[PDB]
Amino acid sequence: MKTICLVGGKLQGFEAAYLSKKAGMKVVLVDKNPQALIRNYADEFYCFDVIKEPEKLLELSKRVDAVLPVNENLACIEFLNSIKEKFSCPVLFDFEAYRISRDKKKSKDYFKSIGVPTPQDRPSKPPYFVKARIIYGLEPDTLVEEYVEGEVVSLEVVGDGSHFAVVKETLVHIDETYDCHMVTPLPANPLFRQISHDLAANLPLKGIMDVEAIFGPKGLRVIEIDARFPSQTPTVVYYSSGINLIELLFRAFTDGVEEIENKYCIYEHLMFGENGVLIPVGEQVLSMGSDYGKFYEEPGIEIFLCKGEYPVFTMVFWGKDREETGAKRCKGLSVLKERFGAVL
Ligand SMILES: Nc1ncnc2c1ncn2[C@@H]1O[C@H](COP(=O)(O)OP(=O)(O)OP(=O)(O)O)[C@@H](O)[C@H]1O
Ligand SMILES: Nc1ncnc2c1ncn2[C@@H]1O[C@H](COP(=O)(O)OP(=O)(O)O)[C@@H](O)[C@H]1O
Ligand SMILES: NCCC[C@@H](N)C(=O)NCCCC[C@H](N)C(=O)O
Ligand SMILES: [Mg+2]
Ligand SMILES: [Mg+2]
């Protein structure tokens, strides 16, 4: 049995914990927040700030198989970079790739440098997209791009520095706030796969990255990369393709990775609002919760409950095809109806 240490216990931390458990690993969580969202989901919880007390994390490294940063606190990531040679196990992160991916303008310069199409900068006609809002005087540093209509599509890539494993396409379902409330799998797209390969190869990526593109009216446009363990999509990747991104990332830092199921999966967040009206919500709502863990499971159905000001449910449905998965979704909703008096 292997043991993984997660630095960060919110949304990324949940995803990494969830897949670590699927792989049969013990999950050790480090988080500075004593009320960290997934404190009760992890197998062990150590409450400290890694920047203030590095020796405690270094000591943990002696007794786990890997340390995975799962936060986007720049102070934390940059400090971890500065002490990474002192660790007694792999640190499953690409610090140079993160320095590029975190900065949207630097990412766009990177895309252009390798000929990857991306939305036009500072356009002259509306609509504009600004970063998240559509516009029909902001800080001098705001990204202004053309608004590209169409499907938002995600691909994860795991690299070992030499080989780049492009995994599974997913559809990012967006709400009125441009947050993601649902994820479903998509058929292979040879163009998007090659672009994602090249984005990883040219870094060169040793670690994990996701690539998001919009399938626009004038073709595919890459909108961002994020070189950190994602939320939401890895669960859909797991059921639809059989690949566990935690296992693949761990392999990239041990024996290496090789290039290249066909099930369906529906993943979504639902809030139980005023007098049990069921409302779709984005990730951002879930991150304001106080406690997050497993609520229910049967064949083809997992439900997680995120407690707080109005309970939020994360629903995971799978099956051999769209039809069987739709059937499980209906069953999962009725589990909420008969139990709680929920409407949808
Ligand atoms: N130096 C650190 N040591 C330990 N845990 C940390 C550190 N920095 C961040 N974290 C934890 O990682 C989790 C995710 O942090 P992140 O900054 O990515 O998300 P956030 O939504 O901006 O959270 P916050 O409310 O802290 O701003 C949080 O639970 C946070 O407490
Ligand atoms: N240029 C664009 N044109 C149209 N929609 C966009 C554009 N950029 C972003 N979006 C929309 O805004 C959402 C969030 O943008 P994203 O670049 O993915 O930010 P983040 O780094 O915050 O996740 C996207 O999922 C997409 O729905
Ligand atoms: N592959 C497409 C994924 C986009 C979105 N699902 C995401 O990963 N968001 C991560 C937000 C995490 C915020 C914060 N660092 C936290 O961990 O809570
Ligand atoms: Mg994005
Ligand atoms: Mg992003």
Coordinates of C-alpha atoms and ligand atoms in Angstrom, one line a residue:
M1 CA 0.0 0.0 0.0
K2 CA 1.2 3.5 -0.9
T3 CA 0.6 6.8 1.0
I4 CA 0.2 10.2 -0.6
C5 CA 0.5 13.6 1.2
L6 CA -1.7 16.4 -0.1
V7 CA -0.8 20.0 0.6
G8 CA -4.2 21.7 0.3
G9 CA -7.7 20.4 1.3
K10 CA -10.2 22.3 -0.8
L11 CA -11.4 21.4 -4.3
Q12 CA -8.1 20.2 -5.9
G13 CA -7.4 18.4 -2.6
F14 CA -10.8 16.6 -2.8
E15 CA -10.2 15.4 -6.3
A16 CA -6.8 14.1 -5.5
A17 CA -8.0 12.4 -2.3
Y18 CA -11.0 10.8 -4.2
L19 CA -8.7 9.2 -6.9
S20 CA -6.0 8.3 -4.3
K21 CA -8.7 6.2 -2.5
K22 CA -9.8 4.6 -5.8
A23 CA -6.1 3.6 -6.3
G24 CA -6.0 2.0 -2.8
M25 CA -3.7 4.7 -1.2
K26 CA -3.8 6.2 2.2
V27 CA -4.4 10.0 2.1
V28 CA -2.5 12.3 4.5
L29 CA -3.7 15.9 4.3
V30 CA -1.7 19.0 5.3
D31 CA -3.7 22.3 5.5
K32 CA -3.2 25.6 7.5
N33 CA -7.1 25.9 7.9
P34 CA -8.3 23.9 11.0
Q35 CA -11.7 23.8 9.3
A36 CA -10.2 22.7 5.9
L37 CA -13.0 21.5 3.6
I38 CA -11.8 17.8 3.3
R39 CA -10.3 17.4 6.8
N40 CA -12.7 14.5 7.6
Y41 CA -12.4 12.8 4.2
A42 CA -8.6 12.3 4.5
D43 CA -7.2 9.4 6.5
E44 CA -4.9 11.7 8.6
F45 CA -5.1 15.5 9.0
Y46 CA -2.1 17.7 10.1
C47 CA -3.0 21.4 10.6
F48 CA 0.0 23.7 9.9
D49 CA 1.2 26.2 7.4
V50 CA 4.1 24.6 5.4
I51 CA 5.7 28.1 4.9
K52 CA 5.8 28.7 8.7
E53 CA 6.8 25.2 9.7
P54 CA 8.6 23.5 6.8
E55 CA 10.4 20.9 9.1
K56 CA 7.0 19.3 9.8
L57 CA 6.4 18.7 6.1
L58 CA 10.0 17.5 5.5
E59 CA 9.5 15.0 8.4
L60 CA 6.2 13.8 6.7
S61 CA 8.2 13.3 3.4
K62 CA 10.2 10.6 5.2
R63 CA 7.0 8.5 5.8
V64 CA 4.9 8.9 2.6
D65 CA 5.5 7.8 -1.0
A66 CA 4.8 11.2 -2.6
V67 CA 3.9 14.9 -1.8
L68 CA 1.4 16.5 -4.1
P69 CA 0.8 20.2 -3.9
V70 CA -2.9 20.8 -4.5
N71 CA -3.3 24.6 -4.0
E72 CA -2.8 27.8 -6.0
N73 CA -1.4 29.9 -3.2
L74 CA 1.6 31.4 -5.0
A75 CA 3.5 32.0 -1.8
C76 CA 3.1 28.3 -0.9
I77 CA 4.1 27.0 -4.4
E78 CA 7.1 29.3 -4.6
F79 CA 8.3 28.3 -1.1
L80 CA 7.9 24.6 -1.8
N81 CA 10.0 25.2 -5.0
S82 CA 12.8 26.7 -2.8
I83 CA 13.0 23.6 -0.5
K84 CA 12.1 20.8 -3.0
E85 CA 15.7 19.2 -2.9
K86 CA 15.3 18.6 0.9
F87 CA 12.3 16.2 0.5
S88 CA 12.7 12.5 1.1
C89 CA 10.1 11.5 -1.5
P90 CA 9.1 12.8 -5.0
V91 CA 7.3 16.2 -5.2
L92 CA 4.6 15.6 -7.9
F93 CA 4.7 19.0 -9.5
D94 CA 6.3 20.9 -12.4
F95 CA 7.3 24.3 -11.0
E96 CA 8.5 25.8 -14.3
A97 CA 5.3 24.8 -16.0
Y98 CA 3.2 26.3 -13.2
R99 CA 5.1 29.7 -13.5
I100 CA 3.9 29.8 -17.1
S101 CA 0.4 28.4 -16.7
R102 CA -0.6 30.6 -13.7
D103 CA -0.1 33.8 -15.7
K104 CA -2.7 34.0 -18.5
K105 CA -0.7 36.5 -20.6
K106 CA 2.6 34.5 -20.3
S107 CA 0.5 31.4 -21.3
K108 CA -0.7 33.2 -24.4
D109 CA 2.9 34.2 -25.4
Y110 CA 3.8 30.5 -25.0
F111 CA 0.8 29.4 -27.2
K112 CA 1.8 31.9 -30.0
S113 CA 5.5 30.8 -29.7
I114 CA 4.5 27.3 -30.8
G115 CA 1.8 28.3 -33.3
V116 CA -1.2 27.3 -31.2
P117 CA -4.4 29.3 -32.0
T118 CA -5.8 31.4 -29.1
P119 CA -8.4 34.1 -28.9
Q120 CA -7.5 37.5 -30.4
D121 CA -6.0 40.0 -27.8
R122 CA -7.5 43.5 -27.3
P123 CA -10.2 43.3 -30.1
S124 CA -11.9 46.5 -31.5
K125 CA -15.6 45.4 -31.7
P126 CA -17.9 43.8 -29.1
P127 CA -18.4 41.3 -27.6
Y128 CA -15.3 41.2 -25.4
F129 CA -14.5 38.6 -22.8
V130 CA -12.6 40.0 -19.8
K131 CA -10.7 38.1 -17.0
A132 CA -14.8 36.4 -15.7
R133 CA -17.5 38.5 -17.5
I134 CA -18.8 39.3 -21.0
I135 CA -18.8 43.0 -22.0
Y136 CA -21.0 44.6 -24.7
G137 CA -12.0 51.4 -17.0
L138 CA -10.5 48.2 -15.5
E139 CA -7.0 47.7 -14.0
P140 CA -4.2 48.1 -16.6
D141 CA -3.5 44.4 -16.2
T142 CA -6.9 42.9 -17.2
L143 CA -6.9 40.4 -20.1
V144 CA -9.3 41.5 -22.8
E145 CA -10.0 38.9 -25.6
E146 CA -12.5 38.4 -28.3
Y147 CA -15.6 36.4 -27.1
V148 CA -15.4 32.9 -28.7
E149 CA -18.8 31.1 -28.7
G150 CA -18.9 27.3 -28.5
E151 CA -18.1 24.2 -26.4
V152 CA -15.5 24.4 -23.7
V153 CA -13.4 21.3 -23.9
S154 CA -10.8 19.9 -21.5
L155 CA -7.8 17.5 -21.8
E156 CA -5.3 16.4 -19.2
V157 CA -1.7 15.5 -20.1
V158 CA 0.7 13.7 -17.9
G159 CA 4.4 14.0 -18.8
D160 CA 7.6 12.3 -17.4
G161 CA 9.9 14.9 -19.1
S162 CA 10.3 12.7 -22.2
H163 CA 6.9 11.1 -23.0
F164 CA 3.5 12.9 -22.9
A165 CA 0.4 10.9 -22.2
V166 CA -2.7 12.7 -23.6
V167 CA -5.7 11.3 -21.7
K168 CA -9.5 11.9 -22.3
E169 CA -11.6 14.8 -23.7
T170 CA -14.3 16.2 -21.4
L171 CA -17.0 18.8 -21.9
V172 CA -17.0 21.6 -19.4
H173 CA -20.7 22.7 -18.9
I174 CA -20.7 26.4 -17.9
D175 CA -23.3 28.5 -16.0
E176 CA -24.4 32.2 -16.0
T177 CA -21.3 33.0 -13.9
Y178 CA -18.9 31.1 -16.3
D179 CA -18.3 28.6 -13.6
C180 CA -18.5 24.8 -14.2
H181 CA -21.6 22.9 -12.8
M182 CA -21.3 19.7 -14.8
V183 CA -18.7 17.6 -16.8
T184 CA -19.4 14.8 -19.4
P185 CA -17.0 12.9 -21.7
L186 CA -16.4 13.6 -25.4
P187 CA -15.2 11.5 -28.4
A188 CA -11.5 11.7 -29.4
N189 CA -10.5 14.9 -31.2
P190 CA -7.2 14.3 -33.2
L191 CA -6.5 18.1 -33.5
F192 CA -7.0 18.9 -29.8
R193 CA -5.0 15.8 -28.9
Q194 CA -2.0 16.9 -31.0
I195 CA -2.2 20.6 -29.7
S196 CA -2.3 19.3 -26.1
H197 CA 0.7 17.0 -26.8
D198 CA 2.7 19.8 -28.2
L199 CA 1.9 22.2 -25.3
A200 CA 3.2 19.5 -22.9
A201 CA 6.2 18.5 -25.1
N202 CA 7.6 22.0 -25.6
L203 CA 7.7 22.8 -21.8
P204 CA 8.8 19.9 -21.3
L205 CA 6.2 18.7 -18.8
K206 CA 7.2 16.5 -15.9
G207 CA 3.9 16.4 -14.0
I208 CA 0.2 17.1 -14.9
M209 CA -1.5 19.9 -16.8
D210 CA -4.9 20.5 -18.2
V211 CA -5.6 22.3 -21.5
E212 CA -8.9 24.1 -22.1
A213 CA -10.0 25.1 -25.6
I214 CA -13.2 26.4 -27.1
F215 CA -14.5 24.8 -30.3
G216 CA -15.4 28.1 -32.0
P217 CA -17.1 29.1 -35.3
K218 CA -13.7 29.7 -36.9
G219 CA -12.0 26.6 -35.3
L220 CA -10.4 25.5 -32.1
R221 CA -8.9 28.2 -29.8
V222 CA -6.8 27.4 -26.7
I223 CA -8.0 29.7 -23.8
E224 CA -5.7 28.5 -21.0
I225 CA -3.5 25.8 -19.5
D226 CA -3.3 25.0 -15.8
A227 CA -0.2 22.9 -14.6
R228 CA -1.7 21.7 -11.4
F229 CA -4.0 18.8 -10.4
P230 CA -7.5 19.7 -11.5
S231 CA -11.0 19.2 -10.0
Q232 CA -14.1 17.7 -11.6
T233 CA -12.7 16.4 -14.9
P234 CA -10.4 13.7 -13.4
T235 CA -13.5 11.9 -12.0
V236 CA -15.1 11.9 -15.5
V237 CA -11.8 10.7 -17.0
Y238 CA -11.7 7.8 -14.5
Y239 CA -15.1 6.4 -15.3
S240 CA -15.2 7.1 -19.0
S241 CA -11.6 6.0 -19.8
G242 CA -10.5 3.7 -16.9
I243 CA -7.4 5.9 -16.3
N244 CA -6.7 7.2 -12.8
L245 CA -4.8 10.5 -13.1
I246 CA -3.2 10.1 -9.6
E247 CA -1.8 6.7 -10.6
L248 CA -0.6 8.1 -13.9
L249 CA 1.1 11.1 -12.2
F250 CA 2.8 8.9 -9.6
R251 CA 4.1 6.7 -12.5
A252 CA 5.5 9.9 -14.3
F253 CA 7.8 10.4 -11.2
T254 CA 8.8 6.8 -10.7
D255 CA 9.1 4.4 -13.7
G256 CA 7.8 6.8 -16.4
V257 CA 4.8 7.1 -18.7
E258 CA 3.8 5.9 -22.2
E259 CA 1.9 7.7 -24.9
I260 CA -1.9 7.1 -25.8
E261 CA -12.8 1.8 -21.6
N262 CA -15.4 3.8 -23.6
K263 CA -18.1 4.3 -20.9
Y264 CA -20.2 7.4 -20.2
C265 CA -20.2 9.5 -17.0
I266 CA -22.3 12.5 -15.7
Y267 CA -20.7 14.6 -13.0
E268 CA -22.6 17.6 -11.5
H269 CA -23.1 19.9 -8.5
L270 CA -26.6 20.6 -7.2
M271 CA -27.6 22.9 -4.3
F272 CA -30.7 22.2 -2.1
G273 CA -31.9 25.8 -1.9
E274 CA -35.0 27.6 -0.4
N275 CA -37.5 25.0 0.7
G276 CA -35.7 22.1 -1.1
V277 CA -35.7 23.6 -4.7
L278 CA -32.7 21.9 -6.5
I279 CA -30.4 24.4 -8.2
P280 CA -27.3 23.8 -10.3
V281 CA -24.2 25.5 -8.9
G282 CA -20.6 26.0 -9.9
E283 CA -17.4 24.9 -8.1
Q284 CA -17.1 28.4 -6.5
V285 CA -20.3 27.7 -4.4
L286 CA -19.0 24.3 -3.2
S287 CA -15.7 25.9 -2.1
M288 CA -17.5 28.0 0.5
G289 CA -18.7 24.8 2.3
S290 CA -17.5 23.7 5.7
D291 CA -17.4 19.9 5.4
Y292 CA -17.2 17.6 2.4
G293 CA -17.4 13.8 2.2
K294 CA -19.3 10.7 0.9
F295 CA -23.1 10.8 1.3
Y296 CA -24.3 7.8 -0.7
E297 CA -23.2 5.0 -3.1
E298 CA -24.8 2.2 -5.1
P299 CA -23.8 0.6 -8.5
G300 CA -23.2 3.4 -11.0
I301 CA -24.0 6.2 -8.4
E302 CA -21.8 8.2 -6.0
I303 CA -23.1 11.2 -4.1
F304 CA -20.9 13.5 -2.0
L305 CA -22.3 16.1 0.4
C306 CA -20.7 19.5 1.0
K307 CA -22.2 21.0 4.2
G308 CA -22.6 24.8 4.8
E309 CA -25.1 27.6 4.2
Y310 CA -27.3 25.4 2.1
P311 CA -26.1 21.8 1.4
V312 CA -24.4 21.1 -1.9
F313 CA -24.4 17.7 -3.5
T314 CA -21.8 16.4 -6.0
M315 CA -23.3 13.6 -8.1
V316 CA -21.3 11.1 -10.1
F317 CA -23.2 8.7 -12.5
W318 CA -21.7 6.1 -14.8
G319 CA -22.6 3.2 -17.1
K320 CA -21.8 1.5 -20.5
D321 CA -23.5 4.4 -22.5
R322 CA -25.5 7.7 -22.3
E323 CA -28.7 5.7 -21.8
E324 CA -27.6 3.6 -18.8
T325 CA -25.9 6.7 -17.3
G326 CA -29.1 8.8 -17.7
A327 CA -31.0 5.9 -16.0
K328 CA -28.6 6.1 -13.0
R329 CA -28.9 9.9 -12.9
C330 CA -32.7 9.5 -12.6
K331 CA -32.2 7.0 -9.7
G332 CA -29.7 9.4 -8.0
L333 CA -32.1 12.3 -8.1
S334 CA -34.9 10.1 -6.7
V335 CA -32.6 9.2 -3.8
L336 CA -32.6 12.9 -3.0
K337 CA -36.4 13.2 -3.6
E338 CA -37.6 10.3 -1.4
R339 CA -35.0 11.1 1.3
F340 CA -35.1 14.9 1.4
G341 CA -38.3 16.2 -0.5
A342 CA -36.2 17.6 -3.3
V343 CA -37.6 19.1 -6.6
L344 CA -36.0 18.5 -10.0
Ligands
LIG1 N1 1.2 27.5 3.1 C1 0.1 26.6 3.2 N2 0.2 25.6 4.1 C2 -0.9 24.7 4.2 N3 -2.0 24.8 3.5 C3 -2.2 25.8 2.6 C4 -1.1 26.8 2.4 N4 -1.5 27.6 1.4 C5 -2.8 27.2 1.0 N5 -3.1 26.1 1.7 C6 -4.5 25.5 1.6 O1 -4.8 25.0 0.3 C7 -6.2 25.1 0.2 C8 -6.5 25.7 -1.2 O2 -5.9 27.0 -1.2 P1 -6.0 28.0 -2.4 O3 -5.3 29.2 -2.1 O4 -5.6 27.2 -3.7 O5 -7.6 28.2 -2.5 P2 -8.5 29.4 -2.0 O6 -9.9 29.1 -2.4 O7 -7.9 30.7 -2.6 O8 -8.4 29.4 -0.4 P3 -8.2 30.6 0.6 O9 -9.5 30.8 1.3 O10 -7.1 30.1 1.6 O11 -7.8 31.8 -0.2 C9 -6.8 25.9 1.3 O12 -7.6 25.1 2.1 C10 -5.6 26.4 2.0 O13 -5.8 26.6 3.4
LIG2 N1 -12.0 34.2 -25.1 C1 -13.1 33.6 -24.6 N2 -14.2 33.6 -25.3 C2 -15.4 33.0 -24.8 N3 -15.5 32.4 -23.6 C3 -14.4 32.4 -22.8 C4 -13.1 33.0 -23.2 N4 -12.3 32.9 -22.2 C5 -12.9 32.2 -21.2 N5 -14.2 32.0 -21.6 C6 -15.2 31.3 -20.7 O1 -14.9 31.7 -19.4 C7 -14.7 30.5 -18.6 C8 -13.5 30.7 -17.6 O2 -12.3 31.0 -18.3 P1 -10.9 30.3 -18.1 O3 -10.0 30.9 -19.1 O4 -11.1 28.9 -18.4 O5 -10.5 30.8 -16.6 P2 -9.9 29.9 -15.4 O6 -8.4 30.2 -15.4 O7 -10.4 30.9 -14.4 O8 -10.7 28.6 -15.1 C9 -14.4 29.4 -19.6 O9 -14.7 28.0 -19.2 C10 -15.2 29.8 -20.8 O10 -16.6 29.4 -20.5
LIG3 N1 -9.8 20.4 -16.3 C1 -10.7 21.5 -16.3 C2 -10.9 21.9 -14.8 C3 -11.3 23.3 -14.4 C4 -11.8 23.3 -13.0 N2 -12.6 22.1 -12.8 C5 -10.7 23.3 -12.0 O1 -9.9 22.4 -12.1 N3 -10.7 24.1 -10.9 C6 -9.8 24.0 -9.8 C7 -10.1 25.1 -8.8 C8 -9.4 24.9 -7.4 C9 -9.4 26.2 -6.5 C10 -8.5 26.1 -5.3 N4 -7.1 26.0 -5.7 C11 -8.9 24.9 -4.5 O2 -8.1 23.9 -4.4 O3 -10.0 24.9 -3.9
MG4 MG -10.3 28.1 -16.9
MG5 MG -7.9 28.4 -15.4

